[PDB]
Amino acid sequence: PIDVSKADGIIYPQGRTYSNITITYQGLFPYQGDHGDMYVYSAGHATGTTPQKLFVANYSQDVKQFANGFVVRIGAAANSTGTVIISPSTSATIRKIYPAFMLGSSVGNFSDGKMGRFFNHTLVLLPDGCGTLLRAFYCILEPRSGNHCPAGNSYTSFATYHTPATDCSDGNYNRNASLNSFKEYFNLRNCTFMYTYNITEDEILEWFGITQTAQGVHLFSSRYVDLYGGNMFQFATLPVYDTIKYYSIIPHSIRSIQSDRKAWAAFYVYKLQPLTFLLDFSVDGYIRRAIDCG
């Protein structure tokens, strides 16, 4: 659960910082002590050195309202030893992962009737190059009619696969093969844009937040400013054309070999609603102490 007194997941004032004062601010914020929507990613099946069929959860059929945006804590379990999801008896080092986001305004069923189809233009956030690149696009997606494909036969769910035998080598990054893995299931039509963002790979916990205004979709993070701290800070202003009503998480699997199955971190989701917080802006202006009203 998020502790507001521990200064976790608070949206900074957008353009007017302060210093060494206690001030009441009305805005979009989460409740104190929310269990949230914790999700975990796992590696696929493998026997020896053969990357076998995937191993993902059911989150493709899960959809929630976007409402007033939400915050996500990334890598809160890393730099630690934890169990492997596919192999419960195996314990490995927990490594941070970055999630994939799917946002839209229409909800419908697939060819087999399962929930998850989003009509018209859809916003997709997807990390690539072992998470170094942060590709984003609000574009048209089209299903495929092949085997295990959304408009085809033997369809269960859709997911994105990662194979760190060649993706996570020195340099390389297998030329954006997570975008390849997503396009292995979907097709891109009348695409509006392609925003790329760079984040250096590390083992430090971080934060992220997403919201929408009439200007567009605002993406806030701590990687740009507060590396050793953690607070929202404006880095992305996506020029969206329509209001986002619903959101969902893309499943992701890892095609790691069985003898080198490495543990992946689990992330969290906390929704935002309007409140009036009390904030303590320190001498550097960073948020370190915050208390609620409700």
């Binding site: 200007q215 567009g216 202003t237 020029p239 054309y241």
Partner: protein
């Protein structure tokens, strides 16, 4: 005319009482003006002027942040039939910054 004139009209009488009286203070004149912050490329209005304008229920939106805009470059070519401005003056958009 002077201090004592304001003092006399503060009482609506030509006879006042002896006493220390607070009166309207004076302001120091400005020594100049400074206008300096980060600037970049001019704001781009080309796709507004190019292509078919869409319908009223499908209006196309352009956002402008961190740029330079001059109304004499695009409003001069605009054959403006009607110009209204609500909760803002019409001349504020030509000079004021946002």
């Amino acid at each position: 005319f002077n201090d004592l004139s304001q003092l006399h009209c503060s009482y609506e009488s030509f006879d006042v009482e002896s006493g220390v009286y607070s009166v309207s203070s004076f302001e120091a004149k400005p020594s100049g003006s400074v206008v300096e912050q980060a600037e970049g490329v001019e704001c781009d209005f080309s796709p507004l002027l190019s292509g078919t304008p869409p319908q009223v229920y499908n209006f196309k939106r352009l956002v402008f942040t961190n740029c330079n805009y001059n109304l004499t470059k695009l409003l001069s070519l605009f054959s403006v039939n009607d110009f209204t401005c609500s909760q803002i003056s019409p001349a504020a958009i030509a000079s004021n910054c946002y």
